[PDB]
Each structure stands twice: as C-alpha cells, then as structure tokens.
Design a protein around this ligand. Sequence first.
Ligand code: HEM
Ligand code: HEM
Ligand SMILES: Fc1cccc(CCNCCc2ccnc(-n3ccnc3)n2)c1
Ligand SMILES: Fc1cccc(CCNCCc2ccnc(-n3ccnc3)n2)c1
Ligand SMILES: C[C@H](O)[C@H](O)[C@H]1CNc2nc(N)[nH]c(=O)c2N1
Ligand SMILES: C[C@H](O)[C@H](O)[C@H]1CNc2nc(N)[nH]c(=O)c2N1
Ligand SMILES: [Zn+2]
Lengths: 407, 411
Amino acid sequence: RFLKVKNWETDVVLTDTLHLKSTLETGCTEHICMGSIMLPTKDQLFPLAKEFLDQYYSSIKRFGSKAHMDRLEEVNKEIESTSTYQLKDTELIYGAKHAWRNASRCVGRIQWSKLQVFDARDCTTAHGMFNYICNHVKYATNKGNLRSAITIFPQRTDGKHDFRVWNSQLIRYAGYKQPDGSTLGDPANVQFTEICIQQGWKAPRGRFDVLPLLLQANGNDPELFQIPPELVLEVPIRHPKFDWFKDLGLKWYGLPAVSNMLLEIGGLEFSACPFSGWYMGTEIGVRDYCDNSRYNILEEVAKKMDLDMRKTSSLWKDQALVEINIAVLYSFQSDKVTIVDHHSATESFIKHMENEYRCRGGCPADWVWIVPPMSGSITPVFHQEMLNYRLTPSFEYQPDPWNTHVW
Amino acid sequence: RFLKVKNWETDVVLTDTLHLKSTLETGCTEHICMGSIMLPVRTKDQLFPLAKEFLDQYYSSIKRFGSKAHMDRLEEVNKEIESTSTYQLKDTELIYGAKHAWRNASRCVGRIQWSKLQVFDARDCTTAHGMFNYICNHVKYATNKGNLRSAITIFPQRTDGKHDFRVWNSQLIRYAGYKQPDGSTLGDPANVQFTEICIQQGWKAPRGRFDVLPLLLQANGNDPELFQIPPELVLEVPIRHPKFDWFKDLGLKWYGLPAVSNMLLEIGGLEFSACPFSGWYMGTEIGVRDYCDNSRYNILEEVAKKMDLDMRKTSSLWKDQALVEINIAVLYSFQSDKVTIVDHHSATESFIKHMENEYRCRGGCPADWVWIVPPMSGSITPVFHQEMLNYRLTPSFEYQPDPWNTHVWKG
Ligand code: HEM
Ligand code: HEM
Ligand SMILES: Fc1cccc(CCNCCc2ccnc(-n3ccnc3)n2)c1
Ligand SMILES: Fc1cccc(CCNCCc2ccnc(-n3ccnc3)n2)c1
Ligand SMILES: C[C@H](O)[C@H](O)[C@H]1CNc2nc(N)[nH]c(=O)c2N1
Ligand SMILES: C[C@H](O)[C@H](O)[C@H]1CNc2nc(N)[nH]c(=O)c2N1
Ligand SMILES: [Zn+2]
C-alpha cells in the first residue's frame, strides 16, 4: 500500500504516499485495467467541504488553529442554513491551482503554482461572460508571451441555473460538411458549427474561421458573441527549409484554452471555468494536423517532399510527420509566440514529478496522456513508471450542454 | 457484463464479453491504475480446478465438450493429480496451450499469427547438453535462412521447484556488454550483468561491440552450463541506409532472430519455466529501443552529428530526425538481405484487423496499449486511437525472477 515507481532508463525509484488520499475512482478493477479508455446535498457537502478546508489550512500551516476551526464552523453553519457555501478568494485561488496540480493528464503542471486566477463569480449574464472571457484571452496571449490563466464563473446551485461555455475551447475553427462528401475546416467541430449556424452565426464558410463563443448564463439559453478578431493571435505555418511549405496555407491559433470542463473545489462545482496555458508543439503538428479525423495533411506534405509513398516501410509518414512538427515550432518561434517542444516539456515534467515526490509524496500521472504522440521512447516520460489516481480539487469532464440544456 | 471499446479515429465501437474469463489479477484497483507499471511449489488443492478449467477450454475448442473423451480425460488427470501430485499434458494439449499463451499475450502486437506456431516438445530433455541441442534446432528451424518462422521449445515443467529447467539468457540471441574501468560500456549495456555471469562461469569474451553471448543452461535444478551457439547458425544483418553511404561506417549490425528465453509458460496450472519462443522483429524494437534508448547503444547523437543537424536546439527536433533515419536503415537492411521484418505501420494495422476478428470470433482481445503502441510515431498508427481492455487469461506467459537471484548453487 506504499508503492514504488521506477524509471527504467535512470533506475531511479520513488515512493508514492499521496495516492493514499485518492478519493475519486479510476474505472479500473483487480480484474481489468481501463487505462486506455478516453472517458469512463447537505450531508454529502459538508465532508467534501471539510476535506478541502482541512487541506487548505494545512497548506498555510495554521492547521487545527482557531482560524481553522472557526472557518469550519462558519461554513458548516452556512451549508446547514443555505445548503451551499461560498469560497473565500484565497481558498478559491488555492482550489484552482491545486485542481491543476492534480490534473494527471497535464504534462505542463511544473507551472502549476504560477496560475493567474480571475474570479468571475459576480458575473450574471452572458454578456458579462463575454467581457470576462475577452479579458482572459487578452491577458493570457499577452502579445504572444503567454501566461497561464483561469476565469471562474458562478458555481452551480440547483443545477437549473448553470453557467456554461458551449465551445470546448475558447478558440477553435469551424467545420462544414460539403455537398461534396468531404469536410471544409476542422472536422472536430462540425456539430458545434451546426449549432452556431442554428443559433444564427453567419459562417464565412472558410477552412479556418474562428468560431464564435456560445455563452450560457444562469441556466439561460446561450447567446453568440464573436471574439474581437484583434484578440485572436494566429500563426501562419512555415518550414525553415521547405520554401513550398507555406503554400499549403496552414495557420493555427496561439492560445490553447480548455473551456468545457467542470472544476470541483471543496465540493462545489464550477461548470464554467475556461483555462489556458500554451501549446506543446505536438498538440498542433501531430494531433491537429495529422489525425485522420482532423486536418489530415500528411499525404499532401509527403507528396511535396517527393517521398516514395509506395510502401509503408520507407517511413514516409514518419518523415513528413517530423517536418510538419519542425514547421510548427519554427513558425511560433519566429513570431515569438510561446510554444514548448515535447522533449523540453517532458524533460521538465520529470523534474516536476521529482519535486512532487520529494515535497508532496507523489504526483498523479496518466502515462497514456503524458507521453507525446510522436517519438515516445526518446522523451524521458516513456521510461518513467507513473501511478494514476484522482485527487480533489479536480477538473472533470461533463456532458456536452446541447445534450441536456432545455430551451 | 458487456464492455465497450471505442475507436477515436473511426468511431467503431466493440464489445467485450471475454474479460469475463479473466481469473488472474491486474495490479489496478478502483483507487489506482497501475497500467504503466512494468511488473504486475503449487498444491494439488489449487491444481485440479486449473487443470479442469484448461481442459474444458481445450475440449470446447475441439467441439468435444462433455464428450466421453472429455470426461475420461478429466477423470484421468484427476487421478494423476491425486496419486502423483502433478500431471502430464498430451501433445495436442501442449500445442493448444502454447498457441493460446501467445493468443492471450496482451503486450504482443504480433498475435495475428497466433495459430501458425511451431511447437517443439522438449519434455524428454534431461540435461543441459540436451537443452543446447534442442535450442540449436530451434534457432536453425526458426531462422530458416532469413525466412523466419515462429517457434517455441518447451522443456519439462516445474515439479517441486527444486528441479527447474531454466535458460539463464534473457533472449537466445543477444550481444555482450562490458563495463569499462572509465565508466563507459562496450556493446550492449542491457547485458553487462549477465555478461559478467558468463565470464565468471568461464566464457572467454572477445570483448567486442557485437559479441554473441553464450547460452547458460540449467537442467533439472542443476547449476547451469555454458554453450556457444554455432556462429553459422546465428544470422546477422549489417545496417546500412539507402541514401546515406556513411551509415554503414557506423559499424552497426543486428541479429535476425528475436527470441524471448526468460518467461514462464503456464498451462492448466502447470509451469514450464524454460520455454524459449521466437517470432520476427518489428523494426522499432531495434532502431528505436535497441539503438536509441540512452541505456542501450545510444547512437542518436552520433547519427545526428553525421547528418549535421542543428543540435544546439532540441526544438530543431534533431533527435526525431535521426530517429526516423535509423529506423529506415534497419528496415532497409533486413529487406535487402531477405530477413523477415515488419515495420510499425504494417504491424499495427495487422493487429487491429486481428483484434477486430477476435472481438467477432472470441468476444474480446486483451491488449495492453502502453506496450502495443509503437515507440515512435504513436498517433499515426491505427492502434493509438484504439481503446483497449487489458486483462489476464490463461494459458499465459508470465515473468519469473532472474535465476541468478534464486538459484541454489551445488558448487
Ligand atoms: C502551462 C502550459 C501548459 C502545458 C504545456 C499543458 C500541457 C497539456 C497537455 C499536452 C495536455 C494533454 C491534452 C490532450 O492531448 O488532449 C494537457 C491536458 C490538461 N491540462 Fe494542461 N498544459 C498547460 C497548462 C494548463 C493549465 C493552466 C491547466 C489548468 C489550470 C491545465 C490543466 C490541464 C487539464 C485538466 C488537462 C486534461 C485535459 C483533458 O482531459 O482533455 N493545463 N495539458
Ligand atoms: C510473429 C512475429 C511477432 C512479432 C512481430 C511480435 C511483436 C512483439 C513486440 C513488438 C512485443 C513487445 C516487446 C517489447 O517491447 O519489449 C512483443 C511482446 C511479446 N510477444 Fe511477440 N511478436 C511476435 C511473435 C510472438 C510469438 C511467437 C510469441 C509467443 C509464442 C509472442 C509472445 C509475446 C509476448 C509474451 C510478449 C510480451 C513481452 C514481454 O512481456 O517482455 N510473440 N511481441
Ligand atoms: F478529440 C478529443 C475528444 C474528446 C476529448 C479530447 C481531449 C481534449 N483535451 C484538451 C485538448 C486541449 C486543447 C487546448 N488546450 C489544452 N490545454 C491547455 C492547457 N492544458 C491543456 N488542451 C479530444
Ligand atoms: F529492460 C526490460 C526489462 C524487463 C522487460 C523488458 C521488455 C522485454 N520484452 C521482450 C522483448 C523482446 C526481445 C526479443 N523478442 C521479443 N518478442 C519476440 C516475439 N515477441 C516478443 N521480445 C525490458
Ligand atoms: C484511446 C487512447 O486512450 C486515446 O487515443 C488517447 C491516447 N493518448 C492521448 N494522449 C493525449 N495527450 N491526449 C489524448 O487525448 C490521448 N488520447
Ligand atoms: C515504464 C513503462 O511502462 C515502460 O517504458 C514501458 C512502456 N511501453 C513499452 N512498450 C513496449 N512495446 N515495450 C516496452 O518495454 C515498454 N516499456
Ligand atoms: Zn488500470
């Protein structure tokens, strides 16, 4: 029940004690590991609140202090009275940072503690949402020198009045199916686009149309806003060696911002909580450009590179893949927009895991997501055993709102 | 229960009813997933159920379930266990056993081939010299002049665990490593220790970068003995690259026969602690792991130097660039000398056809994604987007400790 993790390349062995705080379940049993599956009231609330405050007061070394107890007392009163409660700003700051610290699929967590947190708990309408979201965008892009940030909309109440951002990220390109059979744009967003167009968006019908935001406040029908165009920094993609690369007309956006998750602190659920960091090159070059279901540009690139695409064992896919990724890192670097390569990212997460082991006694990590999708074994996370578990505060998945919102 | 696995590339959803036979355990709990953890003397008591289970499987598979012959064999085994404490498998059972151990190997990407396995029955083997001979025949039949065939040789089963047959090498064919006084390593770092054991047992080491190891063979729980494979039996391929003429001048070669010699084959509760098996290589095993782990031959820097990539910035992706070249060189050299090899695109596509089949025919295919996904270019191979359920069926291949840690020396 105290578990060791070994690195098979360095023979370093660490002991995890933190897992023994796991609360949420994994999907796995003694009989069957589910590690590669992408998606598996007053009395419930007080214990959730208690565990949180307890860890909070711990973290500021006033555990068991009058300040501590009083707080527990007050929150307890408040749940009993109001059946919910409100987080102090400091507690909210700490909750958000720790939900990131606990994000076991996130390779970028060495940064966890620098997070800029923006409290949008006073917001009441969709327009107020849009304004808060634009400031977050601007702050975070910071003219290409990206900074971490999260904006936190009012917490859930009776679940009739949810704040949600319908977009799955703040910035993403539209998807249009053609009378042709094929797909113009990002095939990931075809459905969501049908919903913007339903709700009224006048689609430019291009390959790289920034999607409008779709904001729902206080359980209301969501409404549409376009992000100021001048607030969306974009990078045209070129290759340091192939002059013809730019001719593919590719660009990607600089700010990666996840806008569909649910942040749970001390038992309260912030169902609208967009957060943003900066990209690892492979998110774009491998997944975004290369996944069959996405922009799918491998075949077109190999063909410019004049590779023998006649058989798989020439490795022409692997060739073209490396180049597309060279091209991405080089284009962000030339435009001075922050981007991290997968060597550098994983190198730093290994340091991060060691501090977490040293100073926390563990670090939850999901090897399936931590290891980059190209050149796995030449990054150090490959050789690193990781234990995956769920600690709270946490980011959780939640059902897409078009499935559940009634109008 | 049914369980569904989705493919994210294709939206195909599959259903697994097979995990319902999984008896062994995973290491996972609902509070922790140990899916990336490398490592997850038996009484009559336990044995009969294991025998019966196995034999129900065998008999169902031959469409003879509940037949007299089925029942009589149950009976026979039963009595053999009570009077002798163990039992002996029929040939056809040892054959179905070893086919299924492979079929159930969830870390093996090569399983579309599970039914074409040549099983050599070395159960009458009684000495170390007997083992050498059996193994030499395995290498030669498996190598088949470069047109590789799958094979496994199966020495007698454990009895009281004091008399175990064991091949101390971890693969039948593999290169010496030597630690030097200066800290450096000559040849394959992975095998320094076992190399030190052989030197100690009396091997006279060439001390080269590519010395084939001797076999170290334990029969009947006796101390084990050294044997040189006949060099003429050991196929090797010099590595050259189809455009880079300086690639050959790196001095690389690799052997053609990949053969796992350290696992434990379990059938109907019996335990075969010496059961060398071999297949053919997937290119990445050599050109990614063997050549490019830092803890292995580690030729990355040297290849990138020769390609004269920008190496001052890891974001030039110089490592990724040399990685692709080294792997093209491996697939290229093997194909040129006509030695069987499969690339990772071809290997993983085959496996996904296999795995779908298995869901239709069998109702499942235990698979371990951490292992099944290749170690370069993960996402552009169709396994990456395939959700997989990992679980343990028998018959099966297990890990066993290294014999040097457990062997009781006779002297
Ligand atoms: C600082 C720069 C950051 C980097 C380089 C980074 C890196 C990554 C990567 C590569 C993933 C995998 C996502 C995928 O492949 O689909 C990921 C997921 C995630 N990251 Fe980050 N991240 C960063 C900042 C943040 C911040 C600021 C937060 C929250 C405050 C966060 C929380 C998460 C979470 C919850 C996931 C899981 C997403 C999911 O389940 O789809 N990350 N991160
Ligand atoms: C026919 C060609 C074959 C191919 C291409 C193939 C491919 C592979 C690969 C790439 C691995 C992962 C090895 C590693 O990364 O360390 C593997 C593992 C394995 N294969 Fe195969 N294999 C083949 C034949 C066989 C055969 C004939 C058997 C048994 C009869 C077998 C049983 C296994 C087992 C048990 C593992 C797990 C390895 C371990 O746990 O260390 N394979 N296979
Ligand atoms: F194709 C899919 C279907 C369902 C879920 C999924 C995973 C999405 N994971 C978030 C991807 C993403 C995008 C932008 N930014 C981040 N991000 C930023 C900081 N940390 C993560 N992450 C993929
Ligand atoms: F460094 C390590 C410590 C423990 C296990 C490990 C993986 C070894 N896996 C067997 C590798 C291997 C070698 C030759 N041939 C096969 N092979 C042949 C058919 N199927 C697999 N497999 C590495
Ligand atoms: C099926 C498999 O879990 C799935 O495709 C995984 C693989 N690895 C991943 N890795 C990251 N970083 N993000 C992902 O969404 C996934 N998806
Ligand atoms: C620590 C981690 O489990 C280790 O690197 C695993 C990952 N995936 C692997 N995949 C294969 N095919 N072979 C391996 O040895 C490993 N090693
Ligand atoms: Zn698991």
